[PDB]
C-alpha cells in the first residue's frame, strides 16, 4: 500500500495514500504499530503513533485497515488500565516485562478469553431496535449492575435472532440485526470512534445534584449532576488531594478517570490506593476499583495516547452516560493535552495563536466540555443520564490571563477557586468568592430547596462576609490598623471560622474531609445565625470582647463540630446541631445585655 517517506520524531509521514480520511487508523512500519492519520497534505499523510521511534526506517509498508480508529466498548472496561488507546498494561507488564509501551508490542481493546453472563433484555424475535437501545446485560462486578449491553449508534432494524440466557464469550455473536437484509453480526463488545461524538435524542436541564464530598464546594454553591466546572492548579497546590477526595467522595454509578499527562506516581498511587479504599458508596470488596475505570497517561508516554486519552475518556463517559446511569468524569489535565497538541503542532510546524499554544486549542478544548452534560439517553427507551465533567486547568502560556485559561474559564459553567498562597496556610482548596459563580443554583434551588434547602441565604451572607473580610484584611494591611469596629471584627472573626471550618480540608481523612449536605447546611445556618445574632446584638450596644466572651463555647463547639462523622441518629442530621440553637439563643441574649 503506502511507503514510509520520512520519519522525524514521534510522528511519521507516509506517502502513496489515496482515499484516506482524517480519522482512519493504519499500521505504520514493519512491526504493525498502532497509529492514526490525523491530517494529510497531498499524497503524504502524517500519522501520530502511540509508541516511540527507536529504529524505524523509511520504505516500510503502510496498510490502512479501511475503517476509523476508535476504542472497543463492552464488558471488561472496569478493573482495567489503559494508557491512551485502552491497551492492557498488565499484559505488557507480564509479557514485555516493562512499564512503558514498547514499539512492536500490541494488545486488544478488551478481554477475549474472559467469559461473561449474557442475559436477554426487553427484545424478542421481531422486535424493533435502534442505536443505543438496551439489548442485554453483563454479569460482571456483582456489587452493582454497571455492564449494560447496548447496540452501536447509527444502526437500527429488527431483532431477527434473540439469544437466550447463559454463559457466552466475547468473541462469539449472540445477536443479529436484520434491516433490509443481513447487515452484520453483533458481539458482546462494540466498536465506536473516539474522534466522533455520540449522538443523543434531546438535551435536558440539570435537576439533580452530585455529591463531590467537599464542604466548601457544596457549602459555597449547590452541586449539580452533569455540569461543567473548572479547577485552577499551580502544579503542587493541592490538586491531587482534591482530585482523589473528589473521586473517593463521588457517589456516581461509574468513575471515569482520564489523564492526558501526570507525574507518574499519582497513576500508580491511585490504582494501588483505589482497590484498598472505600468511598461513600463502597461495598464489601472493590468499592472504587470495580466501579471505576482507569485511563492514565504519564508524561513519559507518547503524545498520541495523551491526545487520544481525552477522546477515549469522553467516549467512555458518553458510553456510560448512554446506558442511563450517572457517571463522574474527572480529567487531569487540559494543560497536558494542550501541551501535547502544542508539541504535535511544533513538530508539524503549525503557527500558534495562543501565546505558545495551538490556535485550535481553544475550539478543541471548548468542544470537549460541550460533549459532557445531562440529557436524555440516545435510543428508543429514552432513559435519564448525566455526566459531570470536572477538568483541572493550569496556565502554561506565561501568564495568568492566557487564552487557554480564558477560553476554559469562559466555556465552563461552574467556578471553583484555588490559590497557591491560600493553600500554604493549610486551607486547601482556598476558593475565591469574587471569582466563584454557579449558573445551576437557580435550577438546583427548586429541588434542593424543595427537599430541605437553606444554602442560599447563608451562602449570600457568607460570600458577602468573605468579601467584607477580604476588603477589611486588605484595607487593614494597606492603610494600617490603629482601631477596629465591632461590626467588621465580627465579620472577620466569622470569616476566619468559616474559612477554617470550610476552607480547611484534606484528601487523606474522612473525619475532617467528609460532611453531609444537611450537616453542612446546618453548620452554615448556625454560623450565619451566629453572625446575624452577633451583628444584631452589636447594634443594640455591646463590645467585641463581650460578644465573643458572651458566645464562648458556641463558637468552639461549632468550630469543633467539623472533625466528627455521621454515626448517630437514623439520618444525616445529628442532634448536636439542633441543641446548639437553644444555647446560641441564650448566649446571644446574654451577650447583648
Partner 1 sequence: YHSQVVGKIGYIARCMQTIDPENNLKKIREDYQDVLIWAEKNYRFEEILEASKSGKCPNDLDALSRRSLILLELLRLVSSISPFKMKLDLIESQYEKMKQHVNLWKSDYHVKLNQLNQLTDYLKNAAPTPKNNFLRAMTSVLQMQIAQYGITEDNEGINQLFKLGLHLLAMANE
Partner 2 sequence: NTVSGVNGPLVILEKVKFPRYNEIVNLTLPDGTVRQGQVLEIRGDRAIVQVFEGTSGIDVKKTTVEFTGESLRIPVSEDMLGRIFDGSGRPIDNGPKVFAEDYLDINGSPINPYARIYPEEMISTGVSAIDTMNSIARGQKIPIFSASGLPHNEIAAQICRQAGLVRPTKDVHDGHEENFSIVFAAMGVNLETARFFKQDFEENGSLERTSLFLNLANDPTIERIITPRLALTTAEYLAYQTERHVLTILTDMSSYADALREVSAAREEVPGRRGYPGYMYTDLSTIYERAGRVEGRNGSITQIPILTMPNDDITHPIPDLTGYITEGQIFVDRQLHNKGIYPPINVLPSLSRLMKSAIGEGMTRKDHGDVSNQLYAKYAIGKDAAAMKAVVGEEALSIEDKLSLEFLEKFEKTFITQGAYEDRTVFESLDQAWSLLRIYPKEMLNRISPKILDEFY
Binding residues: 233-240
> CA-to-CA distance for 387 and 401, rounded, in angstroms?
29
Asked if residue 180 binds partner 1 (CB under 8 A), the reply is yes
CA angle (415 as vertex; 223, 462 as ends), nearest 5: 75
Asked if residue 96 binds partner 2 (CB under 8 A), the reply is yes
Candidates 504, 510, 529, 535; binder of partner 2 (CB under 8 A) is 504
246 to 285, contacts with partner 1 by CB under 8 A? 282
417 to 456, contacts with partner 2 by CB under 8 A? 420-421, 423-427, 433-434, 437, 439
Nearer to partner 1, 131 or 453 (CB): 131
Pick the stretch among 131-139, 213-221, 238-246, 398-406 that binds partner 1 (CB under 8 A).
131-139
Asked if residue 349 binds partner 2 (CB under 8 A), the reply is yes
Pick the stretch among 214-222, 321-329, 355-363, 522-530 that binds partner 2 (CB under 8 A).
355-363
Asked if residue 376 binds partner 2 (CB under 8 A), the reply is no
110 to 139, contacts with partner 2 by CB under 8 A? none
Asked if residue 545 binds partner 2 (CB under 8 A), the reply is no
> CA-to-CA distance for 536 and 108, rounded, in angstroms?
68
Contact (CB, 8 A) for 218 and 416: no
DSSP 152: P
Taking residues 472 to 491 in sequence order and writing x for each that binds partner 2 by CB under 8 A, - otherwise, the string is --xxxxxxxxxx--------
257 sits in which H/E element? strand 254-259
Asked if residue 133 binds partner 1 (CB under 8 A), the reply is yes
Pick the stretch among 140-148, 182-190, 210-218, 258-266 that binds partner 2 (CB under 8 A).
258-266
Residue 52 partner contact from partner 2, partner 1, none using kind-dependent CB cut-offs of 5 to 8 Å: partner 2
CA angle (373 as vertex; 233, 330 as ends), nearest 5: 35
Other CB atoms closer than 10 Å to residue 315's CB: what's the count? 25
Whether the upstream peptide bond of residue 266 has omega within 30° of 0, thus cis, is no
Nearer to partner 2, 459 or 574 (CB): 459
Residue 543 partner contact from partner 1, partner 2, none using kind-dependent CB cut-offs of 5 to 8 Å: none
Asked if residue 369 binds partner 2 (CB under 8 A), the reply is yes
> CA-to-CA distance for 71 and 68, rounded, in angstroms?
10
Length of the chain: 593
Nearer to partner 2, 302 or 516 (CB): 302
Residue 18 partner contact from partner 1, partner 2, none using kind-dependent CB cut-offs of 5 to 8 Å: partner 2
Asked if residue 238 binds partner 2 (CB under 8 A), the reply is yes
Residue 311 C-alpha cell reads as 477522546
> According to DSSP H, which parts of 143-222 are helical?
215-220
Asked if residue 382 binds partner 2 (CB under 8 A), the reply is no
> CA-to-CA distance for 102 and 531, rounded, in angstroms?
62
Other CB atoms closer than 10 Å to residue 102's CB: what's the count? 14
Asked if residue 179 binds partner 1 (CB under 8 A), the reply is yes
Asked if residue 77 binds partner 2 (CB under 8 A), the reply is no
| DSSP reduced 3-state for 226 | coil
Candidates 172, 276, 370, 593; binder of partner 2 (CB under 8 A) is 370
Candidates 10, 104, 356, 381; binder of partner 1 (CB under 8 A) is 381
Candidates 35, 136, 362, 516; binder of partner 2 (CB under 8 A) is 362
Nearer to partner 2, 15 or 565 (CB): 15
Contact (CB, 8 A) for 288 and 282: yes
Burial 127-139 (b: 16+ CB within 10 A, else e): eebbbbbbbbbbe
Residues with Cβ within 8 Å of residue 408, at least 6 apart in sequence: 230, 334, 365, 366, 369, 391, 393
Of 298, 319, 339, 379, the closest CA to residue 193 belongs to 319
> CA-to-CA distance for 237 and 586, rounded, in angstroms?
42
Asked if residue 293 binds partner 2 (CB under 8 A), the reply is no
Of 248, 294, 252, 255, the closest CA to residue 271 belongs to 294
Contact (CB, 8 A) for 215 and 515: yes
Residue 147 C-alpha cell reads as 455492564
Nearer to partner 2, 117 or 380 (CB): 380
Nearer to partner 2, 55 or 575 (CB): 55
> CA-to-CA distance for 10 and 119, rounded, in angstroms?
44
Pick the stretch among 141-149, 182-190, 299-307, 492-500 that binds partner 1 (CB under 8 A).
141-149
Contact (CB, 8 A) for 2 and 61: yes
Residue 143 partner contact from partner 1, partner 2, none using kind-dependent CB cut-offs of 5 to 8 Å: partner 1
Nearer to partner 2, 51 or 140 (CB): 51
490 to 529, contacts with partner 1 by CB under 8 A? none
Nearer to partner 1, 100 or 139 (CB): 139
Q: Binding site for ATP: residue ranges? A: 233-240
> CA-to-CA distance for 405 and 394, rounded, in angstroms?
7
Pick the stretch among 35-43, 157-165, 277-285, 545-553 that binds partner 2 (CB under 8 A).
35-43
CA angle (226 as vertex; 217, 512 as ends), nearest 5: 25
Nearer to partner 2, 122 or 263 (CB): 263
Q: For residue 505, what are the CA distances in angstroms to 353, 431, 569?
A: 39, 12, 25
Taking residues 384 to 423 in sequence order and writing x for each that binds partner 2 by CB under 8 A, - otherwise, the string is ----------x-x-xx-x-x--xx-xxx-x-x----xx-x
Pick the stretch among 92-100, 171-179, 279-287, 545-553 that binds partner 2 (CB under 8 A).
92-100
Of 313, 204, 291, the closest CA to residue 247 belongs to 291
37 to 66, contacts with partner 2 by CB under 8 A? 39-43, 45, 52-59
Asked if residue 152 binds partner 1 (CB under 8 A), the reply is no
Asked if residue 202 binds partner 1 (CB under 8 A), the reply is yes
Asked if residue 129 binds partner 1 (CB under 8 A), the reply is yes
What count of Cα atoms within 13 Å lies in the side-chain half-sphere of residue 78?
A: 26
Candidates 117, 130, 436, 583; binder of partner 1 (CB under 8 A) is 130
Sign of CA dihedral 307, 310, 316, 318: negative
Residue 473 C-alpha cell reads as 484584611
**Chain residues that interact with partner 1, rule: CB under 8 A:** 122, 127-133, 142-144, 156-158, 179-180, 201-202, 282, 376, 378-384, 567, 571
Amino acid at each position: 500500500y503506502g511507503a514510509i517517506y520520512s520519519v522525524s520524531g514521534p510522528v511519521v509521514i507516509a506517502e502513496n495514500m489515496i482515499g484516506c480520511a482524517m480519522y482512519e487508523l493504519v499500521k505504520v512500519g514493519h512491526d504493525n504499530l498502532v497509529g492514526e492519520v490525523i491530517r494529510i497534505d497531498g499524497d503524504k499523510a502524517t500519522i501520530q503513533v502511540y509508541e516511540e521511534t527507536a529504529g524505524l526506517t523509511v520504505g516500510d509498508p503502510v496498510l490502512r485497515t479501511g475503517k476509523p480508529l476508535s476504542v472497543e466498548l463492552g464488558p471488561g472496561l472496569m478493573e482495567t488500565i489503559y494508557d491512551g488507546i485502552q491497551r492492557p498494561l498488565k499484559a505488557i507488564k507480564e509479557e514485555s516485562q516493562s512499564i512503558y509501551i514498547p514499539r512492536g508490542i500490541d494488545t486488544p481493546a478488551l478481554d477475549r478469553t474472559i467469559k461473561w453472563q449474557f442475559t436477554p433484555g426487553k427484545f424478542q424475535v421481531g422486535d424493533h431496535i435502534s442505536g443505543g437501545d438496551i439489548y442485554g446485560s453483563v454479569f460482571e462486578n456483582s456489587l452493582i449492575s454497571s455492564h449494560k449491553i447496548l447496540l452501536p449508534p447509527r444502526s437500527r432494524g429488527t431483532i431477527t435472532w434473540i439469544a437466550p440466557a447463559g454463559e457466552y464469550t466475547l468473541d462469539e455473536k449472540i445477536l443479529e440485526v436484520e434491516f433490509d437484509g443481513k447487515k452484520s453480526d453483533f458481539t458482546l463488545y462494540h466498536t465506536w470512534p473516539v474522534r466522533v461524538p455520540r449522538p443523543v435524542t434531546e438535551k435536558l436541564s440539570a435537576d439533580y445534584p452530585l455529591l463531590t464530598g467537599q464542604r466548601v464546594l457544596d457549602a459555597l454553591f449547590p452541586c449539580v449532576q452533569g455540569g461543567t466546572t473548572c479547577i485552577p492548579g499551580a502544579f503542587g497546590c493541592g490538586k491531587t488531594v482534591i482530585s482523589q477526595s473528589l473521586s473517593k467522595y463521588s457517589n456516581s454509578d461509574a468513575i471515569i478517570y482520564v489523564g492526558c499527562g501526570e507525574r507518574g506516581n499519582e497513576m500508580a498511587e491511585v490504582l494501588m490506593e483505589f482497590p484498598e479504599l472505600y468511598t461513600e458508596m463502597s461495598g464489601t470488596k472493590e468499592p472504587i476499583m470495580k466501579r471505576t475505570t482507569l485511563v492514565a497517561n504519564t508524561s513519559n508516554m507518547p503524545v498520541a495516547a495523551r491526545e487520544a486519552s481525552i477522546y477515549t475518556g469522553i467516549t467512555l463517559a458518553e458510553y456510560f452516560r448512554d446506558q442511563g446511569k450517572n457517571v463522574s468524569m474527572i480529567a487531569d489535565s487540559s494543560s497536558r493535552w494542550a501541551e501535547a497538541l502544542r508539541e504535535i503542532s511544533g513538530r508539524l510546524g503549525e503557527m500558534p495563536a495562543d501565546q505558545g499554544f495551538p490556535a485550535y486549542l481553544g475550539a478543541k478544548l471548548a468542544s470537549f466540555y460541550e460533549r459532557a452534560g445531562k440529557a436524555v439517553a440516545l435510543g428508543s427507551p429514552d432513559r435519564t443520564g448525566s455526566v459531570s465533567i470536572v477538568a483541572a486547568v493550569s496556565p502554561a502560556g506565561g501568564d495568568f490571563s492566557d487564552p487557554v485559561t480564558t477560553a476554559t474559564l469562559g466555556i465552563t459553567q461552574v467556578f471553583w477557586g484555588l490559590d497557591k498562597k491560600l493553600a500554604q496556610r493549610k486551607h486547601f482548596p482556598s476558593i475565591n468568592t469574587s471569582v466563584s459563580y454557579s449558573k445551576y443554583t437557580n435550577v438546583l434551588n427548586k429541588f434542593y430547596d424543595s427537599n430541605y434547602p437553606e444554602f442560599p441565604v447563608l451562602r449570600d451572607r457568607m460570600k458577602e462576609i468573605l468579601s467584607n473580610a477580604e476588603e477589611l484584611e486588605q484595607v487593614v494591611q494597606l492603610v494600617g490598623k490603629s482601631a477596629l469596629s465591632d461590626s467588621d471584627k465580627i465579620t472577620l472573626d466569622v470569616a476566619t471560622l468559616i474559612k477554617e471550618d470550610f476552607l480547611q480540608q484534606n484528601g487523606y481523612s474522612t473525619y475532617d474531609a467528609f460532611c453531609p449536605i444537611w450537616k453542612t447546611f446546618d453548620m452554615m445556618r448556625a454560623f450565619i445565625s451566629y453572625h446575624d445574632e452577633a451583628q444584631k446584638a452589636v447594634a443594640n450596644g455591646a463590645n467585641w470582647s463581650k460578644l465573643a466572651d458572651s458566645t464562648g463555647d458556641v463558637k468552639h463547639a461549632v468550630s469543633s463540630s467539623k472533625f466528627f462523622e455521621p454515626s448517630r441518629g437514623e439520618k444525616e442530621v445529628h442532634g448536636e446541631f439542633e441543641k446548639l440553637l437553644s444555647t446560641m439563643q441564650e448566649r446571644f441574649a446574654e451577650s447583648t445585655d
